[PDB]
Amino acid sequence: KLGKLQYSLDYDFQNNQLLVGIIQAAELPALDMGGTSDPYVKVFLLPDKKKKFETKVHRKTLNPVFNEQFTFKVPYSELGGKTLVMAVYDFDRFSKHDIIGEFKVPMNTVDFGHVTEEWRDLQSAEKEQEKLGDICFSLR
Amino acid sequence: ELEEMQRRADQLADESLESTRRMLQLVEESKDAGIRTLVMLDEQGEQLDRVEEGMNHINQDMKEAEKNLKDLG
Ligand SMILES: [Mg+2]
């Protein structure tokens, strides 16, 4: 309900690197005072959360246009089992920056060869049980 | 699909490379052919000059012969 996100995706086989372009976003819900939020998008490889990339902060727009580009130096063999994460954040100067949305893209569903560029609907980020342990016994 | 795609890209890279090598060879042959062509042009040029001098000599000689025949008639 927050809005949609237009992004670009393609792989450069000449340098063996992933080219992820953040085009823009639309119809984002307002969380700030003026009637518009201060959005910025954090993008990182889904498999390992290392070297996350963040865009510049746009002031008071529910339709921010970033038109930025990020490069992930990752071989083509490892790429197949690697996912992409694009999460939209709301900037606040005096508090925690609340997450507006998030989107995950499996690299096995992605088809490289033609330059990909699409709009995808944003969804609410997941907050499961922490322990994840189990005990087995018998009763008689 | 993906493996075949990467291999396809590298393939096109190699093909373009060896193609450029072929180009280098071709422009080398062209280069040399051009050089020897110019050489031939110089040689044949000097030959044409000698031909011209020949024609001039013929003209003067026949002018004299004309004079003698007019002096005889
Ligand atoms: Mg704010």
Swiss-Prot record, chain A:
Glycosylated. Expressed in the brain (at protein level). Predominantly expressed in rostral, phylogenetically younger brain regions, and in some endocrine tissues. Residues 1-120 form the C2 domain. Ca(2+) 3 binds at residues 92, 95-96, 98. It is found in: Cytoplasmic vesicle, Secretory vesicle membrane; Cytoplasmic vesicle, Secretory vesicle, Synaptic vesicle membrane; Cytoplasmic vesicle, Secretory vesicle, Chromaffin granule membrane; Cytoplasm. It comes from the Eukaryota. The modification Phosphoserine is found at residue 124. The modification Phosphotyrosine is found at residue 89. Ca(2+) 2 binds at residues 31-32, 90, 92, 98. Ca(2+) 1 binds at residues 32, 38, 90-92. Belongs to the synaptotagmin family. Calcium sensor that participates in triggering neurotransmitter release at the synapse. May have a regulatory role in the membrane interactions during trafficking of synaptic vesicles at the active zone of the synapse. It binds acidic phospholipids with a specificity that requires the presence of both an acidic head group and a diacyl backbone. A Ca(2+)-dependent interaction between synaptotagmin and putative receptors for activated protein kinase C has also been reported. It can bind to at least three additional proteins in a Ca(2+)-independent manner; these are neurexins, syntaxin and AP2. (Microbial infection) Receptor for C.botulinum neurotoxin type B (BoNT/B, botB); interaction is improved in the presence of gangliosides. BoNT/B toxin binds to the membrane proximal vesicular domain of Syt1 (residues 32-51). Homotetramer. Heterodimer; heterodimerizes with SYT2 in presence of calcium. Interacts with SCAMP5. Interacts with STON2. Forms a complex with SV2B, syntaxin 1 and SNAP25. Interacts with SV2A, SV2B and SV2C. Interacts with RIMS1. Interacts with PRRT2. Interacts with DNAJC5 in a phosphorylation-dependent manner. Interacts (via N-terminus) with RAB3A. Interacts with SYT12. Interacts with calmodulin. Interacts with DNM1 (via C-terminal proline-rich domain (PRD)); this interaction facilitates vesicle fission during clathrin-mediated endocytosis (CME). The first C2 domain mediates Ca(2+)-dependent phospholipid binding. The second C2 domain mediates interaction with SV2A and probably with STN2. This is Synaptotagmin-1. It comes from Rattus norvegicus (Rat). The chain holds residues 141 to 281 of 421 of the full protein.
From Swiss-Prot, chain B:
Residues 1-14 are annotated as: Disordered. This is Synaptosomal-associated protein 25. It is found in: Cytoplasm, Perinuclear region; Cell membrane; Synapse, Synaptosome; Photoreceptor inner segment. Residues 10-72 form the t-SNARE coiled-coil homology domain. Residues 1-66 are annotated as: Interaction with CENPF. It comes from Rattus norvegicus (Rat). Belongs to the SNAP-25 family. t-SNARE involved in the molecular regulation of neurotransmitter release. May play an important role in the synaptic function of specific neuronal systems. Associates with proteins involved in vesicle docking and membrane fusion. Regulates plasma membrane recycling through its interaction with CENPF. Modulates the gating characteristics of the delayed rectifier voltage-dependent potassium channel KCNB1 in pancreatic beta cells. The gene is Snap25. Part of the SNARE core complex containing SNAP25, VAMP2 and STX1A;this complex constitutes the basic catalytic machinery of the complex neurotransmitter release apparatus. Recruited to the SNARE complex following binding of the SNARE complex component STX1A to STXBP1. This complex binds CPLX1. Found in a complex containing SYT1, SV2B and syntaxin-1. Found in a ternary complex with STX1A and VAMP8. Interacts with HSC70 and with SYT9, forming a complex with DNAJC5. The interaction with SYT9 is inhibited in presence of calcium. Isoform 1 and isoform 2 interact with BLOC1S6. Interacts with CENPF. The lineage of its organism: Eukaryota, Metazoa, Chordata, Craniata, Vertebrata. Palmitoylated. (Microbial infection) Targeted and hydrolyzed by C.botulinum neurotoxin type A (BoNT/A, botA) which hydrolyzes the 197-Gln-|-Arg-198 bond and inhibits neurotransmitter release. Signal peptide: none annotated. Coiled coil: none annotated. The chain holds residues 10 to 82 of 206 of the full protein.
